[PDB]
Design a binder for this molecule. Sequence first.
Ligand SMILES: Cc1cc2nc3c(=O)[nH]c(=O)nc-3n(C[C@H](O)[C@H](O)[C@H](O)COP(=O)(O)OP(=O)(O)OC[C@H]3O[C@@H](n4cnc5c(N)ncnc54)[C@H](O)[C@@H]3O)c2cc1C
Ligand SMILES: Cc1cc2nc3c(=O)[nH]c(=O)nc-3n(C[C@H](O)[C@H](O)[C@H](O)COP(=O)(O)OP(=O)(O)OC[C@H]3O[C@@H](n4cnc5c(N)ncnc54)[C@H](O)[C@@H]3O)c2cc1C
Ligand SMILES: Nc1ncnc2c1ncn2[C@@H]1O[C@H](COP(=O)(O)O)[C@@H](O)[C@H]1OP(=O)(O)O
Ligand SMILES: Nc1ncnc2c1ncn2[C@@H]1O[C@H](COP(=O)(O)O)[C@@H](O)[C@H]1OP(=O)(O)O
Ligand code: NA
Lengths: 261, 262
Amino acid sequence: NFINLYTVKNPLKCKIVDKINLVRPNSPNEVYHLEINHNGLFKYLEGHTCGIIPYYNKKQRCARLYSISSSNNMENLSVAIKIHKYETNYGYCSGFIKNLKINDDIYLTGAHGYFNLPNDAIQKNTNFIFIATGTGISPYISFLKKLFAYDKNNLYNRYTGYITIYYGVYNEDSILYLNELEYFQKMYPNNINIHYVFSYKQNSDATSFYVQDEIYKRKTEFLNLFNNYKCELYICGHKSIRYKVMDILKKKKKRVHVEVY
Amino acid sequence: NFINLYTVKNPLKCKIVDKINLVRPNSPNEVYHLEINHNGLFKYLEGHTCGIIPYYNKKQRCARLYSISSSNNMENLSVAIKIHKYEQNYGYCSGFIKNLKINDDIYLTGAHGYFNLPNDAIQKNTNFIFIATGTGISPYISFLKKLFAYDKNNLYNSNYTGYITIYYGVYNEDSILYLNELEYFQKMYPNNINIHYVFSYKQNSDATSFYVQDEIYKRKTEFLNLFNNYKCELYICGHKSIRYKVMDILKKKKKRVHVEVY
Ligand SMILES: Cc1cc2nc3c(=O)[nH]c(=O)nc-3n(C[C@H](O)[C@H](O)[C@H](O)COP(=O)(O)OP(=O)(O)OC[C@H]3O[C@@H](n4cnc5c(N)ncnc54)[C@H](O)[C@@H]3O)c2cc1C
Ligand SMILES: Cc1cc2nc3c(=O)[nH]c(=O)nc-3n(C[C@H](O)[C@H](O)[C@H](O)COP(=O)(O)OP(=O)(O)OC[C@H]3O[C@@H](n4cnc5c(N)ncnc54)[C@H](O)[C@@H]3O)c2cc1C
Ligand SMILES: Nc1ncnc2c1ncn2[C@@H]1O[C@H](COP(=O)(O)O)[C@@H](O)[C@H]1OP(=O)(O)O
Ligand SMILES: Nc1ncnc2c1ncn2[C@@H]1O[C@H](COP(=O)(O)O)[C@@H](O)[C@H]1OP(=O)(O)O
Ligand code: NA
C-alpha cells in the first residue's frame, strides 16, 4: 500500500529535527532516537521500517533498515538506532549516525515490511502480545502511539483491548522508550502489562535467561492469552525467539507476525 | 601488510571453483562453502576477512564481510556463507550466493580485520582458547590449517605442539560447520586439541537457555587455569553475548584477548 515509494534510485531528502540518547549511564549500549522532518512526503503504516542511506551526497550507496517508532498522525517520524562498536571503530551506518548533527540531511527509502497492525484494530478492540528485544521495541511503540492516541504535547487527555508486552534488554537503563512505556503503564493499567526480562544478573550467577524462557516459565497463562483472548502475536528482535515461542504453540497461523534481525 | 589491497573502486575478479553445502540434513540453517580461485593475487593472513560485492559488473556496490577459512599456503581461498531468509525472500548477498554457479565471477575486496594469530605462533607453541558460534568457527578453521599444516591431498608434518581448547555453539550436531576438518584434528592430534560443542537444541522442552557462555561458567576454574597458567591467547567470534560473561570470569592481559563479533 505504501511500499517502495522511495528506493535507492530515488531517496527522499529529509531533515534531522532532534537526536536523543535513548539510554542512561548504566547501559553498556549507545542508541539514538532521531526526530526526522520529511514534509509529509514519507508514507508508512505503523510497524513499517524505513531505509537510511549513509553519506548520500563515492559510488557506495548502501541502505540499512530501521523500524519507525512514531505514529502516522505525527508530523515528523521517529527512529531508534543502536551504534555498533568494535576495536574505537564503528559500523558503517552506525558511524554516520554517530556524527549526525542537528539539521543535517538524511536520505530515506520508502515504506518497507509487513509487520503491521490489522485494519480492524481500534474497532474490534483486538488483544495483543508483543515480544521484543533491544531495538525491537520500536514497532511496538509505534503501535501504542496509534492505539492510545499518543501526543507528547497533549498528555493529560484521552481503544479498550488488553496488551501484554514481553521486553528483553540488559538492565533498567537499557529500556528504550522508557518514558513512553511508563506513561502507558501509568495511564492504562487495566489495558497494558509489561514483563521486563533483564539479561544482567546480581544475587545469582545462574544460566542464560532471556525473553523466551520467561514466556516458557509461565507457558500456560501465555497460551491462555493467545487462545481465550484471541491475541495477535508479534515477534521483533533476535531470531532465537522465533522457534522457542512457536513450539510452545505447537489456520491460526495468520495471527502470528515475525520480524527478526 | 595485506590490509585494503583491494577496495570497491578496484575489486579483484575471482572465480568460483566449488560450492559445497556445509550442513547435514537435521539443520534448520543453510550454509555454503565456497572454494574461490583468486589467481594467487589475494594476499591475507589467517583470521582475515574478505569482502564480497554482490552482483558486480541489483544496482548497489556494497560489500559484506566473510571470514577466510583457509591458510595462506593453499592455492584457492575458501569461505563459509550462511544463507539468510525471512518469510514472504533472501538477504542481499544471501540471494547472490544462493544463485551462484560454478565458474561464476565473484569480486573480492582486500584483507580486512585484525583477528589474527600472533607472528610467534608455531615457533613459540602458544596455547589457545577459541570461542565460536555458527560461522564464527571459520577463522579458527584457517588457524588450525596453518598450525597443523593441513593438506587435503596429504592427510596421512606438524611442528606445533601447544594446546588448543575450542568452545563451539551451534543448533545441533548437523549444524557444526567444518565437521570434517574438526573431527580430523581430534583424530590426528588428540593431545594438542580439545573441542566442547554446546548445542542450543534442548532435546527436552523443560529447560532454559544454555549457550556457549554458560559452559564456560560451568567450567569456571578450568577456563581460568587455561588462561592464567598456560598463557592462552583468547579469541571470541560470533554472538555479542559471549564477550561479557567471559570477561566477567576473567575480571595488561588485554592484548591476549581478541574480539570479532557480528
Ligand atoms: C527489518 C529490520 C529492522 C531493523 N530495525 C532496526 C532498528 O529499529 N534499530 C536498529 O538499531 N537496528 C535495526 N535493524 C538493523 C540495522 O540495519 C543495523 O543498524 C545494521 O545492520 C547495522 O548497520 P551498520 O552499518 O552500523 O553495521 P555494519 O557496518 O553493516 O556491520 C554489521 C555489524 O558488524 C560489525 N562490524 C562491521 N565491520 C566490522 C569489522 N571490520 N570488524 C569487526 N566487526 C565489524 C558492526 O559492529 C556491526 O555490528 C533492523 C534490521 C532489519 C533487517
Ligand atoms: C567481521 C565480520 C565477519 C563476518 N563473517 C561471516 C561469515 O564468515 N559467514 C557468514 O555467513 N556471515 C558473516 N558475517 C555477516 C555477513 O556480513 C552477513 O552475510 C550479512 O551481515 C548479512 O547480509 P546479507 O547481504 O546476506 O543480507 P542483508 O539484507 O544485507 O542483511 C540484513 C539481515 O536482515 C534480514 N533482512 C533483510 N531485509 C529484510 C527485510 N526487508 N525485512 C525483514 N528482514 C530483512 C536478512 O534476513 C538478513 O539477515 C560477518 C560479518 C562481519 C562484520
Ligand atoms: N539469543 C537470544 N535470544 C534472546 N535474547 C537475546 C539473545 N542474545 C542476546 N539477547 C538479549 O537481547 C537484548 C538486546 O539485544 P542486543 O544485545 O542485540 O541489543 C540483550 O539483553 C541481550 O542479552 P545479552 O546481555 O546476553 O546480550
Ligand atoms: N546470545 C547468544 N549467545 C550465545 N549464543 C547464541 C546467542 N543467541 C543464539 N546463540 C546460538 O548460536 C548458535 C548459532 O547462531 P546463529 O544461528 O545465530 O549464527 C545457535 O545455536 C544459537 O542458538 P539459538 O538456536 O537459540 O538461536
Ligand atoms: Na553466530
